[PDB]
């Protein structure tokens, strides 16, 4: 089963009489271990809220960051193992960069998501390599394709979501989204909401301690994936803290 | 294990478990069932709702590759020492 020397977790070419693939499933349990990364689609952009894990006492900003820029206007928030996430960042950024060069217009998220998923999926099929141990979101704003949110898991699926969570708290965190009307809503108000969801979900045993990182890609940034200002972070932090009490 | 605890000072030297100690699985012909049975019994009284009594334990394995994750963690395996080929 999990303790074995042939097939099961060694392979992923294996099937059980149920049909399952255990290795691809073990990769899914790996994304679960670290804290939540949420990314919410607005009709005007994407706002992310990520727990940025504080693994030491001698931190500087951007240390073990999970916010990546795939393209100029795509942000990528990862959850689960960061080792696998760095290799995934290089592959996604590379597919986007060449796209911009050739097509000369802003990469459609629907296209980018299909290509990275195929890559994850090529590894899950194979028993020759293991598959990535993280799950990620790509989120973007353009006026050539609209605001899009996509999610790619360790299996190799790409489907669009209008508000998603990956990481430990995601079953709880997702529920809070159904409460919110977020499909139509400014990116300014949604930052306040991603921050308050994270503060309440966190507990001292999903991970020791975190640093709040929120990111913009919307009408406010003018279609640029950038990190939120010091001002923005703090008011959204404040509202999270006041709601927490 | 019970007999060991009651007497005054016991050392149970579990001798040479290579495949007589192996990790839990089932083949549907007999399985690892009989092997794991001894293994599991030793786990239930040791940790239990009663702890290990007056029982010291020494393990001899040539294969830690075989063993169950339960045995390998401390509370019956406090210190690992390799007595292997010498210098």
């Amino acid at each position: 089963m999990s303790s074995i020397g042939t097939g099961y977790d060694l392979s992923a070419s294996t099937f059980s009489p149920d049909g399952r693939v255990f290795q691809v499933e073990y990769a899914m349990k790996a994304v679960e271990n670290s804290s939540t990364a949420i990314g919410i689609r607005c009709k005007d952009g994407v706002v992310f809220g990520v727990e940025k894990l504080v693994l030491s006492k001698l931190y500087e900003e951007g240390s073990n960051k999970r916010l990546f820029n795939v393209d100029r206007h795509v942000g990528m928030a990862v959850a689960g193992l960061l080792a696998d996430a760095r290799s995934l960042a290089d592959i996604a950024r590379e597919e986007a960069s060449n796209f911009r060069s050739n097509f000369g217009y802003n990469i459609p998220l629907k296209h980018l998501a299909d290509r990275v998923a195929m890559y994850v999926h090529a590894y899950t099929l194979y028993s020759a390599v293991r598959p990535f141990g993280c799950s990620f979101m790509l989120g973007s704003y353009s006026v050539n394709d609209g605001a899009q949110l996509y999610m790619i898991d360790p299996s190799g699926v790409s489907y669009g979501y209008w508000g998603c969570a990956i990481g430990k708290a995601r079953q709880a965190a997702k529920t809070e989204i159904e409460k919110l009307q977020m499909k139509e809503m400014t990116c300014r108000d949604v930052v306040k909401e991603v921050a308050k969801i994270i503060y309440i979900v966190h507990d001292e045993v999903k991970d020791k301690a975190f640093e709040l990182e929120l990111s913009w890609v919307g009408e406010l940034t003018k279609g640029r994936h950038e990190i939120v200002p010091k001002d923005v972070r703090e008011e959204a932090e404040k509202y999270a803290k006041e709601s927490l009490k | 294990f019970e007999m060991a605890r009651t007497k005054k000072a016991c050392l149970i030297f579990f001798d040479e478990i290579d495949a007589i100690g192996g990790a839990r699985f089932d083949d549907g012909a007999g399985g690892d069932n009989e092997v794991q049975r001894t293994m599991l019994e030793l786990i239930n009284q040791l940790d239990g709702f009663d702890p290990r009594g007056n029982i010291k334990v020494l393990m001899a394995t040539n294969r830690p590759d075989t063993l169950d994750p339960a045995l390998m963690r401390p509370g019956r395996l406090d210190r690992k020492i390799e007595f292997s080929l010498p210098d």
Binding site: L58, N64, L82, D84 | -
Partner: protein, 238 residues
């Protein structure tokens, strides 16, 4: 166990034990401390050798005219990775001709290290690297794991019994930021000595320093100017 037969072997928790077990190899390596100010990046390292009747071969390696590394772990593997980095740094100097970014270089190591850990029938590399580099955005001192994740620290210690040294790093964490070159090196020595027992206090012979910064390029002091930093002795601060 059989969560670590190959580096594709998952545990039910969802962790590869071989990559973790590769970190235990870094602990066998020699103690190295990485510190930064606002103008210098300083690497303080422990050199060991089999002949102490002979000069000890450096544990500080050349990567760029402003990048130097200190290795903790596997010696062959650290040198092996070093060559990929060296090729890229020197190439970056030809093409881009900036003083290359520590954050940029470090991610490329993350793609290569991932290859064997992803691949069956192979071993991870069990070496932890502390890189000092100075670009035009100031110093950065980065830690790269046996995995592929990086930390941008102000101070880090990976190596043998690195906890003892961190107790010092935690205590003067504020101080590092303000320093000049001299001050960075004395703190790293006071940290470095702690890893080792109470009754062992370093010599210049087994200390190599790689100094990087704004006022300087790349200079390695093996005993050259090591003696003044060592002075002002402090012996194993608890």
């Amino acid at each position: 166990n059989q969560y670590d037969n190959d580096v594709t072997v998952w545990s039910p928790q969802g962790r590869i034990h071989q990559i973790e077990y590769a970190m235990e190899a870094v602990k066998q390596g020699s103690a190295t401390v990485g510190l930064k100010s606002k103008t210098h990046a300083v690497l303080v390292a422990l050199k060991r050798a089999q002949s102490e009747l002979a000069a000890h071969q450096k544990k500080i390696l050349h990567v760029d005219n402003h990048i130097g590394i200190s290795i903790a772990g596997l010696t062959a593997d650290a040198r092996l990775l070093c060559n990929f980095m060296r090729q890229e740094c020197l190439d970056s100097r030809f093409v881009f001709d900036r003083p290359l970014p520590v954050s940029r270089l470090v991610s490329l190591i993350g793609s290569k290290t991932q290859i064997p850990t992803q691949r069956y029938g192979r071993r991870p590399y069990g070496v932890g690297l502390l890189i000092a580099g100075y670009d035009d955005m100031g110093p950065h001192v980065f830690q790269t794991c046996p995995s592929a994740n990086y930390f941008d620290c102000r101070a880090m210690s990976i190596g043998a019994r690195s906890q003892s040294a961190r107790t010092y790093l935690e205590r003067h964490m504020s101080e590092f930021m303000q320093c000049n070159l001299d001050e960075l090196v004395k703190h790293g020595l006071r940290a470095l000595r702690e890893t080792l027992p109470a009754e062992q206090d370093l010599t210049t012979k087994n200390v190599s320093i790689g100094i990087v910064g704004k006022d300087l390029e790349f200079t390695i002091y093996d005993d050259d100017d090591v003696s003044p930093f060592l002075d002002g002795l402090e012996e194993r601060p608890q």
